Design a protein around this ligand. Structure first.
Ligand SMILES: [Cu+2]
Ligand SMILES: [Cu+2]
Ligand SMILES: [Cu+2]
Ligand SMILES: [Cu+2]
Ligand SMILES: [Cu+2]
Ligand SMILES: [Cu+2]
Ligand SMILES: [Cu+2]
Ligand SMILES: [Cu+2]
Lengths: 5, 463, 461
């Protein structure tokens, strides 16, 4: 579910 | 929610840079992570070890088609891992079979300068052999060997001259830590490159005075690596061997992992992480527990939103072992009260980089400090408006981090370090003691900044 | 003087790795004559110059422009005029993406900053100032890069420029002196071209000397020169990394040498064939008197054509050269001082001077300023061997003997570079006017970078 920046 | 996870200042991250190069996933087929073999001693006893380290040129299959022209130590790219032991007299023949002169720097190793240290003043010409002798009196840790001509350190590292150095001792050996090199304890040397036509590198074509960075991640000289896990717990020795890029490490699903070591030593106490940021030259040793996973599972380490390294999970024995609350006793020197506070100011970016108002001069001594006596260093990164994180490094010492802008160090900075990222506008207070006499460099370890002259030298003496 | 002075067995063309010159298929075109660098300011007692190392592009062949470096232009450099006794102020500016150095080859200037050798870095974007007053005879010097390493890589990129030094004596002599018309640089170099007309020093690297097959004259391929006068002055500079030039015309047209590295020759010397090793200079006069409009005379090295001279109509001019050009005042050697021995040794990777490779922070020798000493310089290497052009910073020396015999006919003037044949000991008379740290080395540039280089400190007693 989670993407970074 | 809407915080950055990592300890450094989010506005200063490398990815806010004008000339920032994002990583791109390569098409290259996935393949086993190259684990550099352990360099076999020439001979060994309990008191003496003998090694031959050979800078050489060659070719390395990295991408499909033509092999990449590369440099390495006792291998075509990077280097065989070199094991040193505290208290063991260590003897090294340095041999240069490159067509250019080089230098053998043991980053983080407390050895005499300037010859043993292998900095700017220790040339080894093509075809020449040098002999060095030393006995390490420092705790177990992960160091590394890289080239260090002044200039160009950046070119030669880019060519491929970097190698992991593992320092052993009795204390670390007594800890319940994964230690089967290549099976449950591995180097993870993090680098990037740009591949041109015929899969070749070209440093000068890619040159940028503010740091060189290519789109292709390279781990132990492997593109799109996977590692086959056969144990529950795995130790990863992260080394940032990139010219400039910062790594923001985390698993796809935020699998926790515990840091047990830094540049110069084990941490005093294990520190639990979800997200870990490394600047250039920093090492961080972590334990990952794959207990939640099952045969067939493939778990990926990312940097930001880019996949780096895959962990293929196979059957593994239950591991019930548990880390102690304290790993290592950190014995801080007392500050010699006779000595003042040394102030080191890192300034500029791009072409204007400097330390304390000047660019490095080979022949110029910038500083003196007595051996055996410990001094506070206040290291400031003066540029702010939009700024960048400068990894400050000193030769011939493992220092301690006392404070950041008058506040606590980051949670993973309570052991011995040799490289610290300094945020824009920030002053960090380090506790620096040199054991041996010599001439030692101190500089920013963004390697283009190094070569651009953001570097000074200190002469240590016996009083 | 019909054949070359140096030992034939030792010529570059006997090396195992020899690269012959080949005539390029590129179009013939006018010889580039570098413009004179215009001063920023000038009076009679002061001159002010800005010299900028820059990176650019040059049409050398059809298609893509070659990536080059130069001073105040994309390749080579604008010629720089200095005057004996004039206080010279130079801003040294570096717009390269790499650090460099500004070495004035043959200039009697203080070391090691002004000399601009190994110890005078200038980083990208940085400026430096230098001040000097030349107190030496008129001659042709040159400027080139001198980071240690790599001088070879930077020269290869194109950092070299002719420096002309004026004095009253030379002004009063009857010599062609109209820059770009009857008095021209002949900067002799070679290069190897790769895909897209690019250079790649490191691909072409050889530790014994780098040489490509295509000759390059003042950064021109296949040049011709339009002669509009009977007499022409050529200022020959060997700016090759390694190649020797063996110079002669068709019809064995004679030419007369008036100048060497450091000064006018004491007397003019008539030539049919002339050899130059790395960094040597030779100013010659060519007389085209016996040729008519539309005639064509070619300058060759060995069997290879280099430069076509096209003869147009010229006013007659037969005003000949005096028997004596220049008065050479040899200093008395100091009898206090001993004979210094310098031994150049090895080839390829084993090149060395007096047993050791160059070290930046080691001083290898000392000598008092104002005091002259015999330097015996030996080329020790046996069997086949090479001619090593030995060069000393901070001085113009005199040549006394070669293996106990007379120097070559063109070596009675001041020189800063001398070719030492295999097995040969040459005796030099060396004096330093100024204190500093000056290097001495072979001027085969790969050998310099390969460590065949030492350094001497001069001090006031
Ligand atoms: Cu380092
Ligand atoms: Cu270091
Ligand atoms: Cu920096
Ligand atoms: Cu360093
Ligand atoms: Cu020179
Ligand atoms: Cu010189
Ligand atoms: Cu030589
Ligand atoms: Cu020189």
């Amino acid at each position: 579910s989670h993407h970074h920046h």
